[PDB]
Every structure is written in structure tokens, then in C-alpha cells.
Amino acid sequence: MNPDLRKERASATFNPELITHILDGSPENTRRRREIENLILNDPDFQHEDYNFLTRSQRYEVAVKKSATMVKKMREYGISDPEEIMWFKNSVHRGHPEPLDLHLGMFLPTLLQATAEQQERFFMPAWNLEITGTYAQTEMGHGTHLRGLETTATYDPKTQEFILNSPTVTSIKWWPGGLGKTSNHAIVLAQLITQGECYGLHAFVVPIREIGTHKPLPGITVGDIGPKFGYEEMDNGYLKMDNYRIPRENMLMKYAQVKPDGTYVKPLMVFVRSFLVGNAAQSLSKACTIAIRYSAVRRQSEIKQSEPEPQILDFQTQQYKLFPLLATAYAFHFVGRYMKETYLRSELPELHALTAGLKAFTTWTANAGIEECRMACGGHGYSHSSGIPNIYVTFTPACTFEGENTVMMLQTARFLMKIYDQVRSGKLVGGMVSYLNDLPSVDINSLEGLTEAYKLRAARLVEIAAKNLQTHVSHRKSKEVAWNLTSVDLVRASEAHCHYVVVKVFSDKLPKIQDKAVQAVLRNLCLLYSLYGISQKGGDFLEGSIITGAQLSQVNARILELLTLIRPNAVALVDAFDFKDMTLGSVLGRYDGNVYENLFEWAKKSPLNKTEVHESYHKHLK
Amino acid sequence: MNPDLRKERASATFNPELITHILDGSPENTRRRREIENLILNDPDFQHEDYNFLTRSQRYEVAVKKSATMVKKMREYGISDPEEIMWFKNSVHRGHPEPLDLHLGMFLPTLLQATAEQQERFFMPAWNLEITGTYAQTEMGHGTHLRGLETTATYDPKTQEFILNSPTVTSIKWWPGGLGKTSNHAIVLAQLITQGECYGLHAFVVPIREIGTHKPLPGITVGDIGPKFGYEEMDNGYLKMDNYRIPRENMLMKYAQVKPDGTYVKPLMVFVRSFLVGNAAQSLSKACTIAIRYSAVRRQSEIKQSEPEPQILDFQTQQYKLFPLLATAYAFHFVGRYMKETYLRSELPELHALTAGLKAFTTWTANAGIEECRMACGGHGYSHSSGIPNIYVTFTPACTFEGENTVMMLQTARFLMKIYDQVRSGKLVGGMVSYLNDLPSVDINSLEGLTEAYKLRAARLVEIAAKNLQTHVSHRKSKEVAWNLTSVDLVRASEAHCHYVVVKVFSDKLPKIQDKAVQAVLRNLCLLYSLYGISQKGGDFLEGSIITGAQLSQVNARILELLTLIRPNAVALVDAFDFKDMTLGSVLGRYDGNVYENLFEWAKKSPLNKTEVHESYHKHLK
Ligand SMILES: Cc1cc2nc3c(=O)[nH]c(=O)nc-3n(C[C@H](O)[C@H](O)[C@H](O)COP(=O)(O)OP(=O)(O)OC[C@H]3O[C@@H](n4cnc5c(N)ncnc54)[C@H](O)[C@@H]3O)c2cc1C
Numbered sequence A, B: 001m002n003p004d005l006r007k008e009r010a011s012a013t014f015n016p017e018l019i020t021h022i023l024d025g026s027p028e029n030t031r032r033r034r035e036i037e038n039l040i041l042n043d044p045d046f047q048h049e050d051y052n053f054l055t056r057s058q059r060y061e062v063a064v065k066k067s068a069t070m071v072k073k074m075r076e077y078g079i080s081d082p083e084e085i086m087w088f089k090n091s092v093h094r095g096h097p098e099p100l101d102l103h104l105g106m107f108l109p110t111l112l113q114a115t116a117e118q119q120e121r122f123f124m125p126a127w128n129l130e131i132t133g134t135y136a137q138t139e140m141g142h143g144t145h146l147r148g149l150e151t152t153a154t155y156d157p158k159t160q161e162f163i164l165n166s167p168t169v170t171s172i173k174w175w176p177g178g179l180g181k182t183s184n185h186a187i188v189l190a191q192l193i194t195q196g197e198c199y200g201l202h203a204f205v206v207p208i209r210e211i212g213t214h215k216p217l218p219g220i221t222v223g224d225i226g227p228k229f230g231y232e233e234m235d236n237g238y239l240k241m242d243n244y245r246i247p248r249e250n251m252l253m254k255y256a257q258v259k260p261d262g263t264y265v266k267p268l269m270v271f272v273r274s275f276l277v278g279n280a281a282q283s284l285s286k287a288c289t290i291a292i293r294y295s296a297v298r299r300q301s302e303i304k305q306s307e308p309e310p311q312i313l314d315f316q317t318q319q320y321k322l323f324p325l326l327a328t329a330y331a332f333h334f335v336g337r338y339m340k341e342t343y344l345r346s347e348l349p350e351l352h353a354l355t356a357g358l359k360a361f362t363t364w365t366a367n368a369g370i371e372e373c374r375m376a377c378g379g380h381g382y383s384h385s386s387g388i389p390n391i392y393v394t395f396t397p398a399c400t401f402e403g404e405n406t407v408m409m410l411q412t413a414r415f416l417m418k419i420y421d422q423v424r425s426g427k428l429v430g431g432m433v434s435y436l437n438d439l440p441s442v443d444i445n446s447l448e449g450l451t452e453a454y455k456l457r458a459a460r461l462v463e464i465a466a467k468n469l470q471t472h473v474s475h476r477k478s479k480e481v482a483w484n485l486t487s488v489d490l491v492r493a494s495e496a497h498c499h500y501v502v503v504k505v506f507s508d509k510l511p512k513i514q515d516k517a518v519q520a521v522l523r524n525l526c527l528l529y530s531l532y533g534i535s536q537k538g539g540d541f542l543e544g545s546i547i548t549g550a551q552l553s554q555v556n557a558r559i560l561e562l563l564t565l566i567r568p569n570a571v572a573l574v575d576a577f578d579f580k581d582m583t584l585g586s587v588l589g590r591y592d593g594n595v596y597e598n599l600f601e602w603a604k605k606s607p608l609n610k611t612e613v614h615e616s617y618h619k620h621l622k
């Protein structure tokens, strides 16, 4: 172990193992996860060349190979627990996306909005991988506005079939993972038309590739959508249907149905968001792990000229770049847990609203934070050897899919304005919005005072958004136009509300921490996260007379003091995440700190060094 | 042309051609650039498959091919003007990095710190490409701190040769473009040791590959450093020398020399930074061009339910995401020009300080801004078809190389503290720091008032940094330790100073604009950039009693009003940058707005669609 990394771990004031137990939910979960990880790590069937050393085509291929093997082994091992399944999948794919993602996450599950008959006709085959499926929702012309989807499913009463059609180039399904080259079946969301009337979006099981040959069936045009910022191993695809016929019985009819004669009948998410909040926390933590360990190993420049080059971790600016993000990572981990907890327990509107907002809030912050970690590593951060570019590229789509962040913040804003209007009418509201009862609209030393500051800041920005929205409605009449004209203020209000919630949830968790040394360090992170947010948006607190200019300067001074107090625990705090080297996929972030020797080897193992002379020399230079 | 893009261009209140003339420096420059671009565009020798559709190895190869051809043609065409050379190179490489970058940018130029004898011995051959060279400075263990470089050059008086050696793994040169596989010669920066004494860093011409075979010479270990976040076509490399001997005459001896007997003798940047500021402005402008055009073409969701889906450009949040960045792009273009202007004209310390700061300030802002543009495009922004991921990946290293940004900001801070101390002593200072004479430490309606606000904010943060630094020196004695402990405050002071300079330079440029319609629109951008910066850091202005909370809210309201006022000119303002489609490398940002049809084709032309069935199907799914 690098002596520089050993001294950092020796200075730690707490036992990281205890934090790992908390993150996993219990000591037994930690044990189970580590064992499943070990199970995959030492299995030859899941090993291969570094993804960065393979072409995109080869990445997709190894992905397909591991995913197929993945399903087989979990079945052989009798792994059914959703939690274990996740650990298993994560370990097998080293954090990278995989082509059976929609097959296992949407295809099979959805078949469980289907009838019995259908379930026993498409499930079993799909479960055994005799069939490979995906879910095709998004179209080239529509992602956010589902009402605008153009794909149609027109019933033909003469043959009792649905005619699936992509009338325009924009109607082509676009983005579905596993749709490109992996699946021979796709559940397509289309506008159902029967008896000359449209009844909205419905789901249809659409066979798309021939069994045995995997050849696109007649009337089907399908393929990969091309290279992207990341997601190399994912065959995100497109699907164009030329009045392609399928049986009536291919329509998922659990909720709504269409009779043989064509009569339409009946009818008689928070989960994916909670996961995305966890994903944001985890990716940011991986990034922080790499940058902080590297910062402890990397020595450069100087403080005292008469002293040897110090670890860059010694620099206050370096600490300012990373510790606040380290604190953010922990804050989000607990925020994610709070979400799962709350969801597992009239409070639904509140749940949907908050979950939409937190999903956007956390993914945006983790997004920027990951790149800050990459840059804090200097030049070596740019090489894939740092492992951070892959983490960023793999994570960033989270701000776009499962509800575009800005749209999600506006959804949260609609809820806040509703509550604002209720209070304005004389009603007493509850939940995390209780503070709105104190409208119209502290101690920087305590977490209770800091939480109260965030509460008041949220109340103030909600009031500003409501007032401006009202002004626009009054002068322009249309509430829809008014909404757009105050949308920037509204999103800011949603952001402030979510920020308050994260601070409160993080603060509320501290008292529950059993080990004192653990509680103390996590308290410092909570304090740093809170103070940091105030410093970053000081204007919000000053404009609302929430804190004085003097307190703001105190906040800034206190943030710097916390950095030195956190420094001794920096490395142990990232070790606590318990990421394996294979999971970080980073030479700079290796647990043992032996960076340089391993970096040299990594480079020599890379593709362009297959030969000493590149073919281009003989053709254009010689 | 897309009707949606045509209506935006029709609503413009100015002639974009006039802005293009300004950006190029004159109507004749615009004409010359467009003609050189046309010269390359229609030359078969420079055309090839989309870079995104090629493996990294093939990208490097086509890069080498075009670069070699590039040198030949510029020579055939008699292109010698540095400006034309730039246009030429940019057009040929479509904005992508190229392997002869250091050969032409450093190798040849440096040979012009050499003696005559040497110049006529390595130049001509290198000029004709008979030899390919690079400059190797950075080492695995040192990038920022050059004093710490480990490569040594030990003189051997017996054979009159220098012995180049890489004693450790960290001493290995690392990152030099063109070093990996392209060059057979490298100018190596090494610690010169002769007569038992070290005399610091000196430059040595080191042959590294055999002529004809390009095989690594005995004692030379060289190669590519592996895949990176970007820079696919650049063979950034490593170089390890095992006590490799070269003639004494290989030491660049223009400034310092070493006699045959081994006696050491004598001695008896702002430019690259100015370019990086322009690079930041240009990359951000490319990103803005793509996102704004796409926003005008992309229709989604709704404002009035009774209305058809509007262009997303209609959304205030979308305008808030892009217009401020559009204004930033223009601000930086003029900032870059100001730099070139100032440099072309006792003011050196001031120049070095400001240039270090602006380089960091602009590259950081353009960096974040480019990713904001990518995300504003929704899902399609993630595909390489948007062209933005390549722009970001290609640009981002600017924050790391040519002086790591944080280090550069601290250099600017050292200057500011020096001036602060001079004023404190009773001296009257000049230049952009004149405001410091007003220590110790407006009209939000006018640019003069806004500039003054930025001036006072800078004065206030400089004072805070100086005071805190002083407090630390007083209590801890060591100024070096004190400097580190106030480094976060110092960088903030440098940032505020540079921000003021950008605002002032942008504001000062307006009166010089000849065409009134052009001046008016650019005035709106200057106002937006200024107000936006105040809103983003409101706390700085409020804490210093520079503006009241009431003015801050006015600032925020005024920013929104400016968005609608800018909207009608949004598309024309990006058209003004005059980027060719091939340069943007974006389907979403095409000049004609015909996005969807071209996106479908692009996807079908991509690698994974070479065949309908991927090989992985037959091996792991069938
Ligand atoms: C790597 C990746 C994988 C994906 N995988 C899948 C998959 O498996 N299956 C699938 O079906 N989909 C998938 N998608 C697509 C995803 O579903 C869509 O990208 C998302 O739902 C909406 O993206 P969009 O481009 O359609 O957004 P658009 O809304 O068209 O554009 C986004 C822009 O418009 C703005 N905007 C839109 N509406 C509003 C409004 N009402 N008010 C204010 N601003 C607004 C946004 O804020 C933003 O700036 C994937 C995307 C990516 C990047």
C-alpha cells in the first residue's frame, strides 16, 4: 500500500466498516454484497479486456455475452432477491450499461399489464431468453410529450389484427435500449385507433425479428441509433413499422381491452426516481473516491519552498473542490434512503411532487460534481485511466431520461403553487411543505439553525414565484402563458424546496447513528453541505433577510475550518463506500494507491501500442 | 430550409453578415476565410468517413493522412500567413485535434532557441516532413511543477555527448501530442547536469525512432498513453530514455551553452493564453449555435393546451439556459480580441497576471456552458449527432493544460495582493487595477452602472482576500502557509477581477460598433451577460452593500425581459458565427434545419448497422 494512502487511513477517527454497514442497510447486507461481488470477480465467464480497449462493436458484444450468462447464472444460483439481483448485475457489468436492461427491467415486468393467456405465451419464452425483448416508448419527435406520440395501432375488424404504423420520420421509435440489435420482440406504445376513434396510448407486443435468423420481419426497419457520448455497450435503437400486422391478442389488455368486433372497453414513477437518486449518489461517490485517493497520492508544487512537494490534498483549493462534493454524496445517499423509506410507508401528490424534484436536484448536482472530480485530478483525470470519464458519460443521461430535469422541477413547482394557493385560501397544510403555513415571507452555528435557514429560503422563493406568476396572470389573463413567464422563478422555488429537504433529511439522520465517531464525522459533512449551499447561494438568504452579511462571512470562514477538520478522514470516508477496484475502473483511484507503475502498464496494454509502428506511418509518413 | 428556422431568421433586426465581419476583423478576412474553407471542403484529399464512425486507430490514421497532406498543400498554395494557416488547419481537421500539432506549433518554432548550425540540420528536414517532431515537457509525475521534472541530461566530457535518462516511472515523459507514434524526433526538456552540478531545465533534440523503419531506437521506449475522454486522433505519448546518448550539439544553445570540456555558460505564455480565450469563445459559440438552432426546430410539450406544441425556444427556461451562454460567447470573443490588441501594444506583470486569469475564467465558463447546451437539447443532445459531445471533449482539456486553471487564478491573485500592498503603502497604481486606489471597501439600469458594480465587487473580494491572508500571516507567521489558508478567497478575488474586466471590455466595445442594429443587439447581450453575472452571485454584491435586495430582484426581472427581447435575434446571432455544417459536425445544428430526415440517415450509416444482425447474436443469443 502506498505510504501516502496508509498515513491518511491511519489518521482516520472512525471505523469506515461501520459506515459501509449503514450504506448497505446492515452488516449482513454488506457481507452478502461483498460475497456476491467475489462470486462474479473470480468467475472466468465474466472476465475480459478493459472496455476502453475495445471498439464499440466489441463492447456491445461482450455486454451481450455477459448479460446472457448473467441471466443463466442467477437462475442457476437461485438469485431472486431484487437487491441481490442488483448487486449481481452491477458486479458483472462493472457499472456499464447492458443490452438486456429493458428486457429484464420492463419487458418481463410489464408482462406481469397483461392477461394470463398472454403472460403464458410471451413470458416463459422471454424468461428463458428464447425471446429477447424491449420497451419502445420514445420517438424521434417526442420524448417528454407522450400525448404527441405518432405511432398508431389501428384495429382491423376483418382480420382481428392491429396495424402498427410509423407514418412519419419523427414517429420512428428512438432510443430504446436493446431495441437496436438485441431483441426480437418489442412492447410498443402506440395511439390505439378502432371504430374510427382514437383512445390514446396503449401497449402492444410486437414481434420484430425472425426466430433463428434474427432477421427483421417484413414491414420492420430496425437498427442502432449510432454512437453517443457514452453508452457504448447499449444498442439504443430505432424502429419503423410499415403498417405491420399483429394479432388482436397482442394488445396488453389487463386494464383496457378491444373486443373482436373492435369495441374499445374500460378501464374499469416514484420507484425509478428513488433509484435515480441513489444512482446519482453512487456515481458522485465513485468520482469522489477516485479524486480524493488520487489527491492523497499526487504530490505536486509546494506550500513551503523549503519543504518537499506536498500531497495535493494539502491544498485548501483542492479540499474545497472535493470535500463539499464528498458531503453531497453522503447527503444524497441518505436522501435516497429517505425516499425508499417514505415510499414503502392523501400524501401521494406530495410524494410524486417531491420525488420528481429530488430526482432532478440530485442528478444535476451529481452531474456537475463528477466533472469537478475529474478536473481536480489534473491531466491524468482526462485519461480513461482515471475512470471518471466513463462514470460521467454513463451517469449524465440521468438528467435527461425518466423525466427531463427542468420538466420535473416544474412538476414540483405546480405542487408548491397548489399548496401555496391552499394556504392562501385558509387551509392548513402538512408534510414537508408545512413551512408554507408561515407565509407571507436563525443560527448559523447549529444544524437546527441551518435547517431553519434553508426552510425560510424555500418559503421566500416560493412566495416570489407565486407573486410573479400572479402578476402575469393578472396582466395577461392566460394562466398557461403566465406559467411559462414565471417558469424560471418556479424552477428556482422547486430547487430551494428540494435543497431544504436534503439538508433536513441529512440532519435528521445524524441522531440515529449508533457509533459516536461515525456520527461526529458525518455531522461535519452535514455541516459542510449545509454551509456550502448557503455560501454558494448567499444572495437568496441575504435578499430574504434570513441571515446578515456578517453571518455569510462567518459561513465562509466556517466552511474552510471544516475542510481541515474533515481532511484526516477524507480517504477513510471514501473507502467506506467499499467500491472494488474493478468497479471504479480507475488506475488513479486504486485502493492500494500504487498509481504510477499501474498507469505505465495500462498504457502499454492499450490498442495503439499493439505494434511499435502504426500502419499510418508506412502509408503517409515513410 | 426548415420553415421554423426561416421564420426566426426573418424576425432578426440586424444583418448577421455585419457581425461576421467584426468577428473576422474585416470583410476581407471573412471573404478570405470562407474561400479557404471552400478550398478544403471541395478537395477530395481531405474528405472521409465521419470520425464518430471510425475506431480510434482509424481516427489517428486519417488525422495523420490529412495533416501530412495539409503541410504539402499549404506549401504548394504558398500559404504563410499565420491567420490563414489557422483557418486552413481548422477546415481540414473539422475542429478535431491533429498529430502534427506540436511538430508545427513547437518543434519547428523552437528550432527558430537554436543555433544556426542546428537550425540548418534539423529544421529543413523537419520542415519537409523528412523528420517528424514533438516537444516533450510533462512527465507522469509532474505537469504543473516544472522544477520537479526528473528527466536528466548528463554531459559526458569523454565522448562529448549528453546522456538522457528517465530514472523513475514518474520521470517518463507523458502527454506530448505526436510523441506516441508520429514523431521520430523530440525536443526533450531535462535537468542539465555537467561537471557534477545541475543547472536546471534545458532543451535537447532527441532522435527517438529510426529513419525508414520508424522503429524505436536502442534505449528508447515510446508509445501512446491510451484512450482518453477525447482526443481520439491525437497520439499523446510517453517516452522513457535509458541513458540514451546524443551529441553535445543537440542541446539548444541559443541562450545557454555547454563547452566541449563540459563548462556550463550563460545565459548572457500570453500568446497561447490569448488563443485559449478565443478557443473558449469559439467552442462555446459552436455549442450555442447547435442548441439554439435545434431549439428553434424542436417542438415539444405545450404552453396553451389549445395550441400546437411550440418550438422549445418559446420556453422561458430554455431561453434562460441558452441566451446567457450566447451572451457569454460574444463577451469572450471581444475579451480575446482585447487581449490580442493589448499584447500587440512596466505593464508586463499586469499583462501576465490578467492573461493567466482570463484564460482560466473563460475556459471554465465555456466548459460548463458547453454541457448546458448539450443538455438543453434533451436526449438527442447525448448522441454524437448533436455534435456537442465532441466539442466538449475536445475543448475541456483547455482548463487543464497551458496552466491548470486554479494555479492560474492563484497567479492572478499574487499580482492583486502585490498591487493591494502597494496601494496600502501609499502608491498610486494604474491599469485595470486602478480601482484598488479606492480601498478600503450604482445604477442597475445602465451598462456604466453595471460595470461600476462589478468593479466594486472585485474591490470588495480583493479586500477580503487580503484581510484573511494577513490574519493568517499574523497568527501563523509563515506567508507560504498563510497563502494556502487563504487560497480559496484569493481565487475568488481573481475570478471577480476577471469578471469585471470581461464586463468592462464588452461594454467598452459597444460604442465602436458602426452598424446601429448590430450595436443594439450586442448591447442586449452585454446587458444580459452583466445582469446575469450579478444574479448568479447576488450575495457578493449584497454583502458589500453594492446593490440592495430590491435592485437584485430588479436585476432578475430585467434578465427575463431581455430574453424575450433577444429571442427574435437568437438564430441570426448564432448564424453570425458563420460555422459551416462540417465544422459543427452536427445534424441537430444544421444550417437548413432539416434535422429528422438527416438524423435517420446518419443512424443508418453508423457502424453497428453495417449488417442487420450483429455477430453477437449468433454467438450468444441464437
Ligand atoms: C442514453 C439514453 C438512453 C435512453 N433510453 C431510452 C429507453 O430505453 N427507452 C425510451 O423510450 N427512451 C429512452 N431514452 C429517451 C428519453 O426517454 C427521452 O430523452 C426523454 O424522455 C425526453 O428527451 P427529449 O429529447 O425527447 O426531450 P425534449 O423535451 O424534446 O427536449 C428537452 C429540452 O426541451 C425542454 N422542455 C421540454 N418540454 C418542456 C416544457 N414543458 N417546459 C419547459 N421546457 C421543456 C427541456 O427542458 C430541455 O431543455 C434515452 C435517452 C438517452 C440519452
Ligand SMILES: Cc1cc2nc3c(=O)[nH]c(=O)nc-3n(C[C@H](O)[C@H](O)[C@H](O)COP(=O)(O)OP(=O)(O)OC[C@H]3O[C@@H](n4cnc5c(N)ncnc54)[C@H](O)[C@@H]3O)c2cc1C
Binding pocket: A298, A300, A301, A302, A312, A315, A317, A318, A375, A376, A377, A378, A379, A380, A382, B102, B135, B136, B137, B138, B139, B141, B142, B143, B144, B145, B174, B175, B176, B177, B231, B236, B397, B400, B401, B402, B403, B404, B406, B407, B410
Ligand atoms: C489532452 C491533453 C493533452 C496534453 N498535451 C500535452 C502536450 O502536448 N505536451 C505536454 O508536455 N503536456 C501535455 N499535457 C499535460 C499538461 O501539460 C499537464 O496536464 C498540465 O501542465 C498540468 O497537469 P497535471 O496533471 O500535471 O497537474 P497536477 O498539478 O498534478 O494536478 C492538478 C491538480 O492539482 C492542483 N494543484 C497543483 N498545483 C497546485 C498549487 N500550487 N496550488 C493549488 N492547487 C494546485 C490543481 O489545481 C488540480 O486540482 C496534456 C494534457 C491533456 C489533458
Ligand SMILES: CCCCCCCCC[C@@H](O)CC(=O)O
Binding pocket: A101, A102, A105, A137, A177, A272, A276, A279, A400, A401, A402, A403
Ligand atoms: C437508470 C435505470 C432506469 C432503467 C433503465 C432504462 C433507462 C431509460 C428509461 C426510459 O424509459 C426513461 C424515460 O422514460 O425517459
Ligand SMILES: CCCCCCCCC[C@@H](O)CC(=O)O
Binding pocket: B101, B102, B105, B137, B177, B272, B276, B279, B400, B401, B402, B403
Ligand atoms: C490549445 C492549443 C495549444 C497548442 C497545442 C498543444 C496543447 C498542449 C500544450 C502544453 O504545452 C500545455 C502545457 O504546457 O500544459
